[model samples]
Target: PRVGVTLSGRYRLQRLIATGGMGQVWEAVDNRLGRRVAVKVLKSEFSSDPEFIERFRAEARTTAMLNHPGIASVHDYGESQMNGEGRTAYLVMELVNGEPLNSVLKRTGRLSLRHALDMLEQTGRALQIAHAAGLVHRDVKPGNILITPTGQVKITDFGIAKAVDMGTAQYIAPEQALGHDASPASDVYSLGVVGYEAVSGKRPFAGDGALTVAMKHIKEPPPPLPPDLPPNVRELIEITLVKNPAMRYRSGGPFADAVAAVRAGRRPPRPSQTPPP
Candidate 1:
């Protein structure tokens, strides 16, 4: 809760990054290793539960296996008691070196066609690696997508949401909106929504409220992207946002390749799965 306290008696909390009901995030230092890390300090309430703590540790271990340049890597996870707090669940991770994509969107509104595609391509490959390992990033919104000063992509908090709450709504896939299990295609769909927002600078399915907007993803097609986009580019983006998971790219490898194809001025390959509608 306060700065300068050592978490799990290893990560020395230097400053608070953010806080919520779940708990607080502190910019911390790994004392033994002498490396900077981000520490997600969860509330003592949930930390008191042994089952929840195990699940959290399991997810953290799973996340640690995802070793790619585009992902925010996890280092350590544990539940320990502080002097005042009953028990604390802490996750130590590689601190991201860039700013949130939402911050960029807030200032620039939209990005160039090439710039947006580059971001998608990098993230898609990262997600591709993740999907191959059977890990699904349930939440993939703008905030989780980070961009460095040199324009490199580093997607943050890959498996943390299922471990903790305080996450998303927009960029959800259609099936996900309907309360279905999110598959790799669903993650591709969410990134597609991000791409759509990146180039168009608008919420494609905006309605009155969160519920209405979410339903639109399930029922209605998104409004066409700006007319200036090339047909292949628009169609590729459309494919990512399709309502049916089977119709979308099965995972990020194909999606990343497709984006590359588009960048090379070629058509994306068609999916093998047959679709019902």
Candidate 2:
């Protein structure tokens, strides 16, 4: 994509932000409004598929209805003429000037226990809101989490998420990798994966590839946390990551509550530094 092409005669391209398997994200300007936004343009391969586009748009609409401190606000959505091969469905969102949790981890190695808990707390709140809307963020990797300089976290990317009760299995339960539907309990499993990554500096099931790793989610016990992890905090991660949906946290609130208890000093000790994986 060109750096200065005008999209839909509205957004003026600025620079590429990042590219994913599904789309390309660019820093863009809303010309008519004279404001900046992050624009995500769907890849050409999936552009003409109505089902994919409809599902993507529906999820985007669901996310747009959300107004919370834990989410990035949606600004606009439309077809763009200046991206790749002439036109595409693009979602314009608040241009968050911050770092992805992935970058933060790379720089700091792993978050301290206090910082990890704080980040996880905010993640829970975001998931809580989405869960209330009957949504589940199937892809809740660290890269999808944004943190402002002031230490606030905003979760993004509902592009692959599904309704909590929906039976769709394309990006469904971790067990779907084994052939099944995803449940809220499965979403909790993903959240635990995020928590495990945040605290341990590595994804619990991030083995050779997505398939191999997801199989780990389906069958393997969560690899043990660093020994330095506080007993209670480790327990919290273990509970959320439980292989059986029936065994995981029933809701996001309970996950937050457990973390709160740990942070309030009502639980066991936490490592002051990164615990070796």
Candidate 3:
């Protein structure tokens, strides 16, 4: 059934696919295009908050700018009446028909090294596109990654992104979680967390509460990878989850290259050291 007012005299909402802290995603049919799409509605709490609205719009604009096989494309953006209240801004994006990386992990218990590496490679490629555009996706958890039926991977939800121009809190970075600003290196830390979870089926540093988790990200190293994980893959995870921003991979291409190197049966380069006397 339709949950909110239909927009442009088209696009019937069928059902709610998921709900997030900031919004709810509904399965929608685009009457104009006769295709299915996911309509993400911004939370009412942020309706009057300009900062959140601006951030939301900025993310929509950024996603529109990026066109990659591994990233979901935005189709449209508009405001729609919701539950007899004021109009709410909504973003319609490509509806990926498949399971979230979270569910996939739960179902499979843990992924084999090859499968985990493949997923990371695809996700890394997607992030590389956004990084090249100067957009950093603040949230790169398993839930944000989708696996398509054709075995393709698509990274979703650039809504919480930090654009190079905005200069927001910069608290999204693992280093910034302690008090530093976010940078490309910080983003690699998040991507590394994603790779770790995809392979182990467990978050390396999750704690009892958000604050607790944030503190862990700020102050601690993630737990060691499972023994079954390949040594090189495990080492990569360790580097990415580092709390020091300066020590992590600086960009998606480099991170992806590291994963590629591992798949090719070669160890990726580690951070350089100065010559000793």
Candidate 4:
């Protein structure tokens, strides 16, 4: 899509912000509302896949139902043709002004224990709401976490994330890497990888290919945290990275509480078997 291309006669594409296998996101302006919005346009190839199309629409509907400070807000969604382009599906979302966690990590190498916990706590709160709605964020990597200038963490790109792919293998849970469906436990597991990388400045597992990394996720244990890491904080991350889904945090509340406890210099709490209603 070209800059200035109007979709549905309301959203005007301003510039490209990000792109992935599934789609490209644009910093756009909602002409009718006179406000900035992020528009996600599905890739032309995927647009022809019925399953992908359904999931694209589903992503818009799912995000629209979520109301949380740590999650991006979805405003509108539709399929339209622009400038004689083929039928395209797009979602209008609140434009976040900030950098992705991956970008920050690449620049800074690693985050302080305090900063890592803060980001995880906010992301956990977002996951709490998503799990309650029976939604699992299949992708929970650093790239998906956007941090604003003032330090607000917003988890974006929810339902539209593909099930399993090399691009996402590093953060994928054992189950998801093995082609199983994602669940709240899997989300926690993925977040564990993100948390681990944030504090340690390295991925727990690394390889030359996605298959190699994914195999490690299924067969190998995550390397131990640095000895200098706080005991409580290390424990919090270790539990979440456990290979067995049942052995991990069942929901986001316990995960968030563990991080909070660690930040408070207390022992992390045990995870609950059942999530709160």
Candidate 5:
């Protein structure tokens, strides 16, 4: 629908906020509640694909099941026909009043260690809840993390997230890059990549194409952290970025606990150096 057009006669589209391969997000007003919300509508072209439609609906269902402040709240989900547009799936969510970490990083190369840890801790908490619910957020990147003016962090865009091999190559875990199903550990690994980027202003793996980057994730060791980074923070990143998923944090909760431990002036436990024989 055009701007000012109400979807299902409830949410009035105001303006496009972001667009992705399968959907376009709009800043909208909920006529029923009289509050602003973010509406994600499946792109018209992808509506015809059953897989895309299923994933879109799944996003709403999955997000609706999560009840954490660090995760955006889902208000509603439904399919509707817009003017000159056929059936489309849409999700109404809390309008996060903040900038994405990707934008923040682009504007300011690296965040202060304290800021980065705070963001990571919040994200870890969110992921912990998701993992506890038996959900794995396949996509966990700076672009999916939002930081409010108050410094509260909220993770978004679980649309393509699944318990399997679906994820953005750049941040996908090594096992996921190798076409293995995504597990809690895999999510931890992706979070590690995000943490690494937050401190270093660079991704551990990069190349000309997705395949090249995927290969790097599968084969290359993450570059060493800068010497100036705190020892505990460096240890957390090192263990999480390990090539073996088994060596990563057991889950998001433990990862957050590790960060919390570090922040509390205690050294978090490190991964075992001896590999399984």
Candidate 6:
């Protein structure tokens, strides 16, 4: 849909904000309220039949229920007739006024110890909130995370109303890479990679292709992080990257606490420190 095109007779598409493999995100206005919102238009390939609508609406309601400061809230979901694309499914969400962490990391490689700690804490807390609500963010990567000028992290694209997923090649855990399954442990492993890169300014593994990267995550040991990193920081990355998912922190909450301890110059928390849900 072009700029000024209205979707569901509510959200009016404005300037193009971002375009991903799945769809396009538009800076839109919710007409009923006139508040700016982020609208994601799915590819035309998605079927807009009644069955699809029912399932899509179900998941959208669940995602919309995720209310957290660090999460980009889902405001609404529906399909609208496009200029030539028939009915296209779309989602309206909180418009975050911040640069994606992926760009921030590129512009300024690595982060100060304190900044890295703050980023991880807020991100983990948000993810833990989702976990408590029985949701798992399969895709957790730098590109999917954003930070405002104030350094508050806002995690976007929480695998909702879509299917057939793959966590980024660089962050998927060994088990997930092996196609076993993804659990909260998978998110912990991915966050560990993010933390490692946050301070080291580099990914532990790089390969020619996604499959190659997956193989590396499944087989290779992470090169020791720069020795100059604080011992606690190194320890945090090590435990999180353990090849065995069973050995890593239970989820984002516990892993976040581990990051908190390292930032405070304290020892890592015990594995049993996982929250009792």
Question: Which stretch of 10 consecutive residues in model 2 shows the poorest summed lDDT?
Answer: 163-172
Best by lDDT: 4
Deviation (Å) of 46 in candidate 3: 2.9
Order by TM-score, highest first: 4, 1, 6, 5, 3, 2
Q: List the residue pairs that clash in candidate 4.
A: none
Q: Which stretches of candidate 5 lie over 4 Å from their true place?
A: 1-4, 44-59, 160-167, 270-277
User: How far does residue 150 in candidate 1 sit from its true spot (Å)?
Assistant: 2.8
Model 3: residue 22 alpha-carbon error in angstroms: 1.4
Candidate 1's C-alpha runs over 4 A off are 19-23, 48-50, 161-167, 274-277
Worst 10 residues of 5 by lDDT: 158-167
The global C-alpha lDDT for each of the candidates, from Candidate 1 onward, is: 0.83, 0.72, 0.73, 0.85, 0.82, 0.82
What is the clash count of model 3? 0
Listed per model in order, the count of residue pairs whose N, CA or C atoms clash below 3 Å is 0, 1, 0, 0, 0, 0
- Candidate no. 6 TM-score: 0.88
* Winner by lDDT between candidate 4 and candidate 1: 4
**Which scores higher on TM-score, 3 or 4?**
4
Can you tell me which runs of candidate 4 are displaced by over 4 Å? 49-59, 82-85, 161-167, 274-277
Candidate with the greatest TM-score versus the true structure: 4
Judging by lDDT, tell me the better candidate of 4 and 5: 4
Task: Tell me the tens digit of each residue's lDDT in model 2 across 163-274.
Answer: 3211122123456566566655566667677788788887665444566655666677777999987887888888777666666665566677778888987662232332
Query: Where does candidate 2 clash, by residue pair?
Result: 176-179
Model 5 pairs whose backbones collide: none
Between candidates 3 and 4, the lDDT winner: 4
Q: Cα miss at 22, model 5 (Å)?
A: 2.3
- All candidates' TM-scores? 0.89, 0.82, 0.84, 0.89, 0.85, 0.88
